[PDB]
mmCIF file of C-alpha atoms in Angstrom:
data_model
loop_
_atom_site.group_PDB
_atom_site.id
_atom_site.type_symbol
_atom_site.label_atom_id
_atom_site.label_comp_id
_atom_site.label_asym_id
_atom_site.label_seq_id
_atom_site.Cartn_x
_atom_site.Cartn_y
_atom_site.Cartn_z
ATOM 1 C CA UNK A 1 27.382 -6.872 4.892
ATOM 2 C CA UNK A 2 27.863 -6.586 1.537
ATOM 3 C CA UNK A 3 24.529 -6.529 -0.874
ATOM 4 C CA UNK A 4 24.204 -6.591 -4.797
ATOM 5 C CA UNK A 5 22.065 -3.367 -4.735
ATOM 6 C CA UNK A 6 23.510 0.386 -3.174
ATOM 7 C CA UNK A 7 19.803 1.748 -4.327
ATOM 8 C CA UNK A 8 17.444 -1.533 -3.329
ATOM 9 C CA UNK A 9 15.181 -1.058 -6.430
ATOM 10 C CA UNK A 10 11.152 -0.946 -5.466
ATOM 11 C CA UNK A 11 12.012 -1.212 -1.496
ATOM 12 C CA UNK A 12 14.473 1.856 -0.635
ATOM 13 C CA UNK A 13 13.000 3.962 -3.238
ATOM 14 C CA UNK A 14 8.871 3.487 -2.674
ATOM 15 C CA UNK A 15 9.778 2.844 1.278
ATOM 16 C CA UNK A 16 11.674 6.774 1.523
ATOM 17 C CA UNK A 17 9.118 8.149 0.067
ATOM 18 C CA UNK A 18 6.214 6.087 2.304
ATOM 19 C CA UNK A 19 8.463 7.247 5.324
ATOM 20 C CA UNK A 20 8.855 11.380 5.258
ATOM 21 C CA UNK A 21 5.950 11.652 2.485
ATOM 22 C CA UNK A 22 3.398 9.328 5.036
ATOM 23 C CA UNK A 23 1.798 12.266 5.489
ATOM 24 C CA UNK A 24 2.133 14.710 2.250
ATOM 25 C CA UNK A 25 1.480 11.295 -0.027
ATOM 26 C CA UNK A 26 3.968 9.964 -2.135
ATOM 27 C CA UNK A 27 3.762 9.574 -5.841
ATOM 28 C CA UNK A 28 6.712 9.865 -8.385
ATOM 29 C CA UNK A 29 4.564 7.463 -10.629
ATOM 30 C CA UNK A 30 2.317 9.634 -12.383
ATOM 31 C CA UNK A 31 0.115 8.293 -14.898
ATOM 32 C CA UNK A 32 -1.958 11.236 -15.768
ATOM 33 C CA UNK A 33 -3.828 14.700 -13.995
ATOM 34 C CA UNK A 34 -5.787 17.032 -15.402
ATOM 35 C CA UNK A 35 -3.284 19.200 -14.516
ATOM 36 C CA UNK A 36 -1.103 17.710 -16.749
ATOM 37 C CA UNK A 37 1.486 17.030 -13.546
ATOM 38 C CA UNK A 38 2.114 13.808 -15.331
ATOM 39 C CA UNK A 39 5.711 12.750 -15.163
ATOM 40 C CA UNK A 40 7.072 10.282 -13.363
ATOM 41 C CA UNK A 41 10.424 10.186 -11.953
ATOM 42 C CA UNK A 42 13.307 9.047 -9.468
ATOM 43 C CA UNK A 43 11.642 5.478 -10.166
ATOM 44 C CA UNK A 44 14.512 4.533 -12.835
ATOM 45 C CA UNK A 45 16.674 7.278 -11.939
ATOM 46 C CA UNK A 46 17.328 6.435 -8.423
ATOM 47 C CA UNK A 47 17.186 2.348 -9.509
ATOM 48 C CA UNK A 48 19.832 2.192 -11.715
ATOM 49 C CA UNK A 49 22.068 5.433 -10.472
ATOM 50 C CA UNK A 50 22.971 7.130 -6.244
ATOM 51 C CA UNK A 51 20.541 9.515 -5.453
ATOM 52 C CA UNK A 52 20.774 12.500 -2.865
ATOM 53 C CA UNK A 53 17.596 12.488 -0.436
ATOM 54 C CA UNK A 54 17.384 16.351 -1.580
ATOM 55 C CA UNK A 55 15.214 14.841 -4.980
ATOM 56 C CA UNK A 56 13.208 12.506 -3.245
ATOM 57 C CA UNK A 57 11.988 15.175 -0.821
ATOM 58 C CA UNK A 58 11.781 17.626 -3.060
ATOM 59 C CA UNK A 59 9.464 15.590 -5.189
ATOM 60 C CA UNK A 60 7.678 13.835 -2.616
ATOM 61 C CA UNK A 61 4.358 14.241 -3.815
ATOM 62 C CA UNK A 62 3.924 17.664 -6.162
ATOM 63 C CA UNK A 63 6.966 20.837 -4.946
ATOM 64 C CA UNK A 64 4.640 23.708 -3.622
ATOM 65 C CA UNK A 65 1.492 21.969 -2.996
ATOM 66 C CA UNK A 66 2.551 22.426 1.429
ATOM 67 C CA UNK A 67 2.555 25.858 0.604
ATOM 68 C CA UNK B 1 36.204 -1.622 40.206
ATOM 69 C CA UNK B 2 37.276 0.218 36.811
ATOM 70 C CA UNK B 3 34.652 2.080 35.584
ATOM 71 C CA UNK B 4 31.449 3.121 36.013
ATOM 72 C CA UNK B 5 31.017 2.527 32.774
ATOM 73 C CA UNK B 6 30.085 -1.305 31.196
ATOM 74 C CA UNK B 7 30.003 -1.861 27.886
ATOM 75 C CA UNK B 8 26.858 -4.120 28.881
ATOM 76 C CA UNK B 9 24.447 -2.017 28.864
ATOM 77 C CA UNK B 10 24.484 -0.816 32.877
ATOM 78 C CA UNK B 11 26.178 2.040 34.738
ATOM 79 C CA UNK B 12 27.012 2.960 37.882
ATOM 80 C CA UNK B 13 26.005 7.219 39.099
ATOM 81 C CA UNK B 14 29.350 7.885 41.307
ATOM 82 C CA UNK B 15 27.369 10.315 42.153
ATOM 83 C CA UNK B 16 25.056 8.331 45.151
ATOM 84 C CA UNK B 17 26.176 4.928 44.093
ATOM 85 C CA UNK B 18 23.222 4.233 42.299
ATOM 86 C CA UNK B 19 23.682 1.252 39.664
ATOM 87 C CA UNK B 20 21.409 1.321 36.658
ATOM 88 C CA UNK B 21 20.708 -1.509 34.769
ATOM 89 C CA UNK B 22 19.166 -0.757 30.967
ATOM 90 C CA UNK B 23 19.026 -4.994 30.929
ATOM 91 C CA UNK B 24 15.981 -4.615 32.678
ATOM 92 C CA UNK B 25 14.481 -2.854 29.740
ATOM 93 C CA UNK B 26 16.177 -5.531 26.877
ATOM 94 C CA UNK B 27 14.123 -7.574 24.880
ATOM 95 C CA UNK B 28 14.201 -9.315 21.813
ATOM 96 C CA UNK B 29 10.600 -8.929 20.948
ATOM 97 C CA UNK B 30 11.763 -5.612 22.203
ATOM 98 C CA UNK B 31 9.129 -2.126 21.538
ATOM 99 C CA UNK B 32 7.298 -0.989 18.642
ATOM 100 C CA UNK B 33 6.701 2.819 17.569
ATOM 101 C CA UNK B 34 4.786 4.407 15.079
ATOM 102 C CA UNK B 35 6.997 6.665 12.833
ATOM 103 C CA UNK B 36 5.520 6.638 10.051
ATOM 104 C CA UNK B 37 1.462 6.765 8.740
ATOM 105 C CA UNK B 38 2.057 3.132 6.950
ATOM 106 C CA UNK B 39 5.595 2.538 9.521
ATOM 107 C CA UNK B 40 6.755 0.998 12.521
ATOM 108 C CA UNK B 41 10.504 0.785 14.401
ATOM 109 C CA UNK B 42 11.445 -2.114 15.838
ATOM 110 C CA UNK B 43 13.640 -1.511 18.822
ATOM 111 C CA UNK B 44 15.458 -3.764 21.037
ATOM 112 C CA UNK B 45 17.297 -2.960 24.227
ATOM 113 C CA UNK B 46 20.727 -3.545 24.099
ATOM 114 C CA UNK B 47 19.763 -6.647 21.710
ATOM 115 C CA UNK B 48 18.385 -7.728 18.669
ATOM 116 C CA UNK B 49 14.983 -7.718 17.729
ATOM 117 C CA UNK B 50 14.056 -10.284 15.560
ATOM 118 C CA UNK B 51 11.721 -8.636 13.201
ATOM 119 C CA UNK B 52 14.428 -7.856 11.559
ATOM 120 C CA UNK B 53 17.297 -9.544 9.992
ATOM 121 C CA UNK B 54 19.807 -11.022 12.564
ATOM 122 C CA UNK B 55 22.073 -8.198 15.045
ATOM 123 C CA UNK B 56 20.050 -5.487 13.932
ATOM 124 C CA UNK B 57 18.533 -3.361 16.946
ATOM 125 C CA UNK B 58 16.592 -0.723 15.267
ATOM 126 C CA UNK B 59 14.583 -1.225 12.332
ATOM 127 C CA UNK B 60 11.820 0.130 10.574
ATOM 128 C CA UNK B 61 10.066 -1.975 9.531
ATOM 129 C CA UNK B 62 8.656 -1.699 6.176
ATOM 130 C CA UNK B 63 10.985 -2.882 3.953
ATOM 131 C CA UNK B 64 12.992 -3.589 6.986
ATOM 132 C CA UNK B 65 16.141 -0.895 7.153
ATOM 133 C CA UNK B 66 17.921 -1.001 10.296
ATOM 134 C CA UNK B 67 19.195 2.156 11.502
ATOM 135 C CA UNK B 68 21.358 0.277 14.054
ATOM 136 C CA UNK B 69 22.886 -2.285 14.751
ATOM 137 C CA UNK B 70 22.353 -4.370 18.933
ATOM 138 C CA UNK B 71 25.703 -2.764 19.985
ATOM 139 C CA UNK B 72 25.604 -2.044 23.581
ATOM 140 C CA UNK B 73 26.949 0.835 23.824
ATOM 141 C CA UNK B 74 25.218 2.869 26.871
ATOM 142 C CA UNK B 75 27.039 5.765 28.403
ATOM 143 C CA UNK B 76 26.018 7.912 31.422
ATOM 144 C CA UNK B 77 25.555 11.616 30.491
ATOM 145 C CA UNK B 78 24.481 14.143 33.220
ATOM 146 C CA UNK B 79 21.455 12.343 34.242
ATOM 147 C CA UNK B 80 21.156 11.266 30.605
ATOM 148 C CA UNK B 81 21.298 7.373 29.517
ATOM 149 C CA UNK B 82 22.365 7.282 26.609
ATOM 150 C CA UNK B 83 22.549 4.191 24.425
ATOM 151 C CA UNK B 84 24.262 4.774 21.105
ATOM 152 C CA UNK B 85 23.469 1.605 17.949
ATOM 153 C CA UNK B 86 25.546 2.415 15.268
ATOM 154 C CA UNK B 87 26.930 0.525 11.610
ATOM 155 C CA UNK B 88 22.998 0.280 10.363
ATOM 156 C CA UNK B 89 21.861 -0.348 6.819
ATOM 157 C CA UNK B 90 23.776 2.511 4.232
ATOM 158 C CA UNK B 91 21.379 5.192 4.617
ATOM 159 C CA UNK B 92 20.058 5.904 0.994
ATOM 160 C CA UNK B 93 19.674 9.497 1.900
ATOM 161 C CA UNK B 94 23.236 10.097 1.082
ATOM 162 C CA UNK B 95 25.292 7.195 -0.325
ATOM 163 C CA UNK B 96 27.687 5.444 2.064
ATOM 164 C CA UNK B 97 26.075 7.115 5.014
ATOM 165 C CA UNK B 98 24.603 4.550 7.641
ATOM 166 C CA UNK B 99 21.660 5.280 10.179
ATOM 167 C CA UNK B 100 22.078 6.225 13.827
ATOM 168 C CA UNK B 101 19.774 5.623 17.026
ATOM 169 C CA UNK B 102 20.306 7.406 19.973
ATOM 170 C CA UNK B 103 18.290 6.461 22.677
ATOM 171 C CA UNK B 104 18.151 8.699 25.547
ATOM 172 C CA UNK B 105 16.721 7.756 28.653
ATOM 173 C CA UNK B 106 15.344 10.437 31.085
ATOM 174 C CA UNK B 107 14.359 10.043 34.775
ATOM 175 C CA UNK B 108 10.397 10.355 35.487
ATOM 176 C CA UNK B 109 9.955 10.022 38.550
ATOM 177 C CA UNK B 110 5.515 9.983 38.252
ATOM 178 C CA UNK B 111 5.532 7.955 34.915
ATOM 179 C CA UNK B 112 3.129 8.665 32.367
ATOM 180 C CA UNK B 113 2.596 8.614 28.684
ATOM 181 C CA UNK B 114 5.971 9.906 27.677
ATOM 182 C CA UNK B 115 7.226 6.059 28.921
ATOM 183 C CA UNK B 116 7.268 4.987 25.157
ATOM 184 C CA UNK B 117 10.117 5.529 22.436
ATOM 185 C CA UNK B 118 9.448 9.501 21.851
ATOM 186 C CA UNK B 119 11.110 10.443 18.506
ATOM 187 C CA UNK B 120 12.399 13.910 19.184
ATOM 188 C CA UNK B 121 13.633 14.713 15.447
ATOM 189 C CA UNK B 122 16.157 13.005 12.574
ATOM 190 C CA UNK B 123 19.077 14.585 11.517
ATOM 191 C CA UNK B 124 17.898 15.171 8.039
ATOM 192 C CA UNK B 125 21.465 15.123 6.463
ATOM 193 C CA UNK B 126 23.495 12.715 9.042
ATOM 194 C CA UNK B 127 21.012 10.014 8.896
ATOM 195 C CA UNK B 128 20.747 10.081 12.936
ATOM 196 C CA UNK B 129 17.425 9.815 15.080
ATOM 197 C CA UNK B 130 17.076 10.396 18.526
ATOM 198 C CA UNK B 131 14.831 8.432 20.710
ATOM 199 C CA UNK B 132 13.476 9.756 24.224
ATOM 200 C CA UNK B 133 12.297 7.672 26.857
ATOM 201 C CA UNK B 134 10.900 8.568 30.381
ATOM 202 C CA UNK B 135 11.279 6.306 32.844
ATOM 203 C CA UNK B 136 11.753 5.362 36.463
ATOM 204 C CA UNK B 137 13.809 3.206 35.707
ATOM 205 C CA UNK B 138 16.358 6.078 34.465
ATOM 206 C CA UNK B 139 16.127 7.830 37.555
ATOM 207 C CA UNK B 140 18.396 8.554 40.965
ATOM 208 C CA UNK B 141 16.501 9.860 43.745
ATOM 209 C CA UNK B 142 17.571 13.177 44.811
#
């Protein structure tokens, strides 16, 4: 089986987020916030480059919000 | 007959001659189990599920990622009916890795709320999903 994208921009990206961050919350695209947490991530990275689960998992929503 | 094991989802127990047929649980529609809040997993026993790309035995229904091709390699390992699926889709966690669903059937003669694919855990690094299923169909009466 061969697919044109090893990294399905959109599909694999948002599904992996929703998969393990369904409960935690998933948002790698942040326009703004009064917390100044407006930093988008992984979108262009994991679209064109190969990524590891660590990146997306430790990103998820906010890195220290389960604490 | 040669081997109590068969690549037909049916295994005979060498201790009491109990023939476990898991084809009785087979199906094309399969069974739907809830995983992530906004996601369900499609799973068909010994067959392929039609809700996901042809050949798929296990698949999450959000984007339709395959976590196991519809194989039928059932193994009987110490009262445990193992139905292992492999050759899924490349696991995004590690580029080039593949998903795998391990179906583990356990004897539950009293039946109950355990007669449903119970996700034990997902081995995070190896993209291996473990599934429990407690049913009296998978039991040999001692």
